[PDB]
Paper text:
We determined the crystal structure of the [name] [name] domain to 2.2 Å resolution by single-wavelength anomalous dispersion (SAD). The overall structure of the [name] [name] domain is composed of two cone-shaped chains that are tightly intertwined with each other to form a globular dimeric module. Each monomer is comprised of an N-terminal three-stranded β-sheet capped by an α-helix, with the overall arrangement making an open, hairpin-like structure. A simple analogy for the [name] domain dimer is that it resembles a left-handed handshake, where the sheet and helix from each monomer represent the interlocked palms and thumbs of each hand respectively. The overlapping C-terminal α-helices of each chain bury a large hydrophobic surface area of approximately 2100 Å2 (nearly 1/3rd of the monomer surface area) supporting the notion that the native state of [name] proteins is to form dimers via the [name] domain. There is a very high degree of sequence conservation seen in the hydrophobic core of the [name] [name] domain, particularly along the α-helical surface mediating dimerisation. The high degree of conservation, and high degree of hydrophobicity within the dimerization interface strongly suggests that all of the [name] proteins will form obligatory dimeric structures through similar mechanisms. We attempted to mutate several interfacial residues, but both the full-length mutated [name] proteins and isolated [name] domains were aggregated due to poor protein solubility (not shown). This provides further support for the essential nature of dimer formation. The [name] domain fold is structurally related to the repeat domains found in the PUR (purine-rich element binding protein) family protein Pur-α.
Author numbering:
A (entry chain B), C (entry chain B), E (entry chain B), G (entry chain B): 1 to 43, 51 to 89
B (entry chain A), D (entry chain A), F (entry chain A), H (entry chain A): 5 to 43, 51 to 89
C-alpha cells in the first residue's frame, strides 16, 4: 500500500552536558560527556531511549547521518527524473 | 559506571508511496537502526526518518558537538 | 470451561510495499519488499508486531494458512457428523 | 539492515466449547504461533484464530502477494 | 514494617478445557488439555499469565499447594501458641 | 506447538506483621514462585498468597481436575 | 544543556520485615529478612523494584551510600571554591 | 525460593548545570546503578540522586537496619 503504517517515529531529541571523572587519566582529570534522550513514538505509546555519548561517537554519528542525507537526496534526484 | 552507549548505526533508503501527494509521487524514506550496548545484550532501536526529521537531527547533534567542544576547551584552560 | 478466556486475538492486519536495494546483485538493482503490521489484542492492551516479508516467505505463509484452513474444515466436518 | 523477519509458522487445531451456541455445539479453533527472528533471540507471537479470521487473513495476504508481484514486474520492465 | 507493601497478588483464575491431537500416539488420538489463565495484580497494573496444563502437572500442582496449606496451618498453630 | 508450561513450583512460608489486626498478631504468608517454560528461557512468576487465597486456588484447580478427568473418560468411550 | 532531562528518579522507598526459615541451620531456626520496594519515576511511568535484603547486604549498601554522600560533599566543596 | 537480590552497587558523581539557580551555579549529581540478581540474568536499575534524596535514602535504610537488628535480637532470646 501507500504510507499509512510506518515504523516508530523519532519525536523528541534532548540532551545534557555533564562533567565527569575521566578514565584515560591516572590523576583527577575532568572530561565532558553527553546524556542524549530520544523520544520515539508509534502510530501515543511514547518511549524514551537515553544514551551516553562521547565526542568521537558524536562525530561518527554526524558522519553517518550526513551519508544518509546524501543518499536520500540522490534518491530524490533520481525520482524527480522519471 | 556503564550507562547505555550507542555502538552501531545502520540504515537503509527505501522508496515508498506518498500518502499526502496529489501527484502520487514516490518518496524516499530512511529506515534507521541504532544499536545500543549496556553491558553483549545489545538492543536495537529502529525508527523511520524523513529528510526533514534527519535535517533537524543533524542540527541538534551539531549543537551538542559545539557545546561539548566548548566545555572541553574551558576544562583544558581551567 | 467454555470459551470465555482465550489467547490473544489478531485484530488488525496492514502493510506497505517498499522498493529497496537488493542484496542478491552486485549492481544497483531494486527489489520490492513488504512491511507487514499485525495488531494483536488480549481480552484493550493492543500490541503491534511489524515484520519484513519477501515474496517467497509470503508464499510459504499462504501455503501454511491454507493447510490450517483445510484442517479446520476437516475438523468441522467431523464435528457435524456426531 | 535487519528488520524483524517471520522465520517459522506452527499451529494446532483444538476443539473447544462454544460460548454463543444455543446447541452448545463444539467448535474448532486454531492456535497459531509465528516465530520472528531479528538478529538467535527468536521471539514467538501466539494468537487464536477462528475460521473467519483465518479466511480474512488469507484474503489480505493474497492482496499483498498480488501487489508485490505487480511491483516486481514493473521494476523488471523499468 | 507491617504488611503495607506486598508482592504481586493473584486476583483471578480462569481456565478452558480443549481437546487436541495427542503426541503419545502414532494414530489420530484425541486428548484433553487445560488452558489456565492467572491474573496477577501489583498494589491496578494487572498482568495475565496463561499456561497449558496436563493432568499430571495439575495433580502435582495440587500436591504442592496442599503441602503449602499444611505448612501455613502449622505456622498459624505455632503462632496461636505464644 | 509449544504453549507456555508450568515446570516448577516453589514456595516459602514467612511470618509478617498484620496490618488490620487490633491485637497486632503476626500472620503467616506464602511466597509462591511458579517457573514457566516456553521453549531454556524459563520465566518466574512470584505472588504472595494468604491462606484464603490458597484455599480458593485449591478449589478451582480441583474443579479443573474433575472436568479434565470427565472429558478424558468421555473421550475413551467415544 | 542544563538539567532539563534526567535519569529516572527514585520517588518512593518502603519495606517490610519478615521472619523466615534460615538456610544456615540444619534445624528449624528463624531469621529475619527485609523486603525492600523502591518506586522509580521517569520525567508518570512509575515502576517498582522489589528486592530481598539481608543484614550484611544492608550494611554494605549503607557503606556505599555513605561514600557517595562523602564524594558529593567534596565535589560541592570544590565547586563553592571557584 | 530465590527473590531478587541486590548484588552490586556502583555510582558516578557528575557535575551538571543547575536549572533553578539564579546564579547558574553548577551542582553535583549522583548516577546510581544497582545490579539485581534473580537466578546470571542480572538486571541494572539506574537512577539519578541529589544530595537530599541520598540523605533520605540513608535515613530510611538505617531505620531498616535498626528494625532488622531488633527482630534478630528478639529471635535470639525467643
Amino acid at each position: 500500500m501507500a504510507n499509512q503504517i510506518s515504523l516508530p517515529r523519532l519525536v523528541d531529541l534532548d540532551w545534557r552536558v555533564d562533567i565527569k571523572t575521566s578514565s584515560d587519566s591516572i590523576s583527577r582529570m575532568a572530561v565532558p560527556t553527553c546524556l542524549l534522550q530520544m523520544k520515539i513514538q508509534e502510530d501515543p505509546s511514547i518511549s524514551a531511549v537515553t544514551v551516553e555519548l562521547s565526542k568521537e561517537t558524536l562525530d561518527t554519528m554526524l558522519d553517518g547521518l550526513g551519508r544518509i542525507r546524501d543518499q536520500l537526496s540522490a534518491v530524490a534526484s533520481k525520482l524527480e527524473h522519471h
